[model samples]
Target: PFSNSHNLLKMKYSVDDEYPDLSVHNNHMAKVLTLDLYKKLRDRQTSSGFTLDDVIQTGVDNPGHPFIMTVGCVAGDEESYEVFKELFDPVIEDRHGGYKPTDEHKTDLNADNLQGGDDLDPNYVLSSRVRTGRSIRGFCLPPHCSRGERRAIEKLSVEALGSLGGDLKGKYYALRNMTDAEQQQLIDDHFLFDKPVSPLLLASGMARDWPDARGIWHNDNKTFLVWINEEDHLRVISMQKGGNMKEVFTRFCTGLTQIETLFKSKNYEFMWNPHLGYILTCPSNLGTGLRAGVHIKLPNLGKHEKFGEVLKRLRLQKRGTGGVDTAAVGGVFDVSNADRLGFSEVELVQMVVDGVKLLIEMEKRLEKGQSIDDLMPAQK
Candidate 1:
């Protein structure tokens, strides 16, 4: 068991360790596996006489960790399991306050049930997108999956998309065959997966066969789509213009169900855990893996120095208009809930919808030169 002092040291590394100073690195695997698995695997030999170091390549080059920790936590031996508990229990408890997640797979597809209305100024709210990441059961995640496994996942997903008829009908475009101009258009329209640039992905060997078995499938309307062999085995997405949360959520649920059914028919199942509803490459997406967000113009709200404080109180995160790493343009920002675990899919989406509505109201008041000081609670 990890004592309080050991846990604190693990949380905050000291410079006295024998291993190279990984204190500055965001390597979760290294941080979690430091005491036990890492030491045992340092020189242990396998049946073929290869050390565990040769078998697992994560944290060798990256400053941050890979998905291997997730895989190990769920699949390793008894010793591995013990180490995982010591390493991960603190982090998970800190994140969710020791609250175990419950099964809440239900979704409300009624567009009328949505809160945000289309009356929101287009300049204020540009568009909304809701997406979820999923991995196929019986196969390792990207970092550990074989090339053949990745190709098979892509092939099956493309075929599944083809099976969806009507508004969901679409074609798969292989990244290898897409022209430079076509790729740029996809990026400008925010419709395609950009190349993996994360140091964590690169170090985990997940980026090995880039664009070979990767592709994107989209409906004719471009509202429902899937990105195959990107970060996750599959990234199902539903997006459209404006703050139509109902439409976006409905389309996503419909498309996701169709794909899930198709996979079930083929004897494939999504990776799931009792604690982590849906297994994903990143721990941040361990549960629903759903990211529901809207691009809104918060001209007045964006200017406030305490803007982040407001979002924190609401459990939402703000990103640049272009995407996660991009900068906001014309006062428009991409805002969404920060955590997907420990919450139902509907709850997560509802938080964003409700938060954005409040933000819009605040922005409107500011636009009219009205004082919002009364709306905010006084400082302690």
Candidate 2:
């Protein structure tokens, strides 16, 4: 292991040397293309007198509506057994080497099949019926869609996307594969274009003047995963209600199991090396995993006393190990920096699972009009 140094602290949170000019950045063609598509869709709907409110309320009831959400999983740790067994096992099970469902088909995803309980409400569903011609890229589709309707929707969806001029507009896109211009636009859309999250504003100390924000998942079943490559190429997958979710879930589970089996069967190279706070270039991250926290803005925890304690404790840790700081009112979430410090990926996964479990437990207490601090001692 490497000793933490003061220099590392300065490097970790250092602001970019050069600030980007938004006016110049916004003029990129891809941004224009995407925003244009958004405007065109809006205008078309408006001209047809299809008010957004009217359409949104009734859209869910429609047979082929798409609902989307972002799904993230831990990368390294086996200790996150529930997440690994539930998510990864399914992914590897359904690896039909480079298969794409070009036509409409029923999927094998069902909440009962996946969640395995009769007590829970069935609002959240996941499936793998929709495909994008890649094995690693899983499937998802709108709930309650029929074969005929799915076929029709897929055809039109692809066509409309293709019609959008500039940079392979109609082709399948992923979050990572976007250009710098594209990513910035997306960031802008997330923060500026749509309504801002109220908590975010207040935490940023600008709540009173901020507008409400809107986020679009774009798929119907509510569960979604978007993993992207550097070129901004993306694999967007969703699971909806109906046969599609059931089918896709079956395949995903199958694929996940296959990977685990492979790991068991192999005697792979394992090595231990440590670096100070920096990127990982090791085996653990390659196979075992990565951990990330999403949308964890600062205001969410601004008032938490324990949260402040963690920050102070983190400062102490830095005194010995080259102080790494914690944010109290900056970003939405504060994820562990174990990866940067060369912690095993598997451990990182378990950390996230633990964090999520804590969040769920806190939510339950809050729902009962109780306090999380009461259950656990306030961070002193």
Candidate 3:
């Protein structure tokens, strides 16, 4: 008898039903998301700069504030900058509530509320306060490790590397040329040798050791991110888990839509909806929310029959919630290869939308008495 028949090497392509180019025309949108955000922070200064200060202030104003730090991976030229300006100015004005200041309630900026001011010199105003947020250092073998499980996460990261490479043209060409097995080997080699870090680390106090596996837990969130811009694009890494990927994705989508809807509905002197709230001057984040996800630490399976079965079933698909890139897990939660997929920024937005939709369905299923909790023993 011939060995089992399956199209293991098949690739499929389709342009069937032409959907309206609802594909968020992001050439213009990216220009805006990139530039307007720049204008909002061009002048101010904080621990990091104006953008960081704005984001921090926004968070201080609202408990669930959702702007993730921006990485200028693919810095554009003055001409590109103009393109961004023209593309985004109107959208920011029309969709996202144009830049505004953080709400008045947060005492983080209040001069009198400042901490440790007395010891400072006359030049120090004591008007600034430091607040803590979630940070995931990187991914590594947890002290006593199993090579098998580590290999799986490595594979996922490799896939992401391949995706990241495609996005930057020849930048990640080596990754693009490598076979899946070779890609995994490359990730492992890098993991073993140079180690890696995320851009999120650069914003925190751990800037000293740029690329190392580390993590810090402040409260309820765990954030692991890879900061590859269009430049050195294939340099990917990892962090730890916070909430499930889908849940965080949904929050971002809903948060962004709410902000976007509010801005477009307003005229000039926008009334602060105490119930709805808004980010101070940082506008893009209002409607689309920010793109952020949590890393989950799920158990690794060795070579048992069940292990193969479980691995075979887990698949990543385009989701609908926040129009971000989110992956569904079969059992464990970890930052795997999903992050490195090379989605044009627009494709990424669409994926988030799909993810948000799936997130709602999962929640509904659980609410309607489905036993999804039992599906993953890891939940135990």
TM-score of each: 0.79, 0.26, 0.23
The lDDT per prediction is 0.67, 0.27, 0.26
Error of 1 at 6 (Å): 30
The TM-score that candidate 2 achieves is 0.26
Candidates ranked by lDDT: 1, 2, 3
**Deviating ranges (above 4 Å) for candidate 1:** 1-21, 26-31, 37-86, 95-123, 322-328, 377-380
Q: What lDDT tens digits, residue by residue, belong to model 3 across residues 41-159?
A: 33323221112222222222222212432321111111221233333344344433332222221111122221221221111111111111111112111221123323333343334
Please report how far candidate 3 places residue 8 from its true position, in Å.
53
Tens digit of lDDT per residue, candidate 2, span 1-380? 53334324433432332111223222111112222232322222222122211212211122221232111111121122122232222322222111122212222222234432111112111111222111111111111112343334333333333343322222333322446685575464331133234231222122221121111122222333322221011223333332233334333334323322432344311112122111111112222222322223233333456654543432211111111144333333433323312233223333433443344355455556667675452322
For candidate 3, the per-residue lDDT at 73 reads 18
Question: How far off is residue 272 in model 1, in Å?
Answer: 0.9
**Clashes by residue pair, model 1:** 124-297
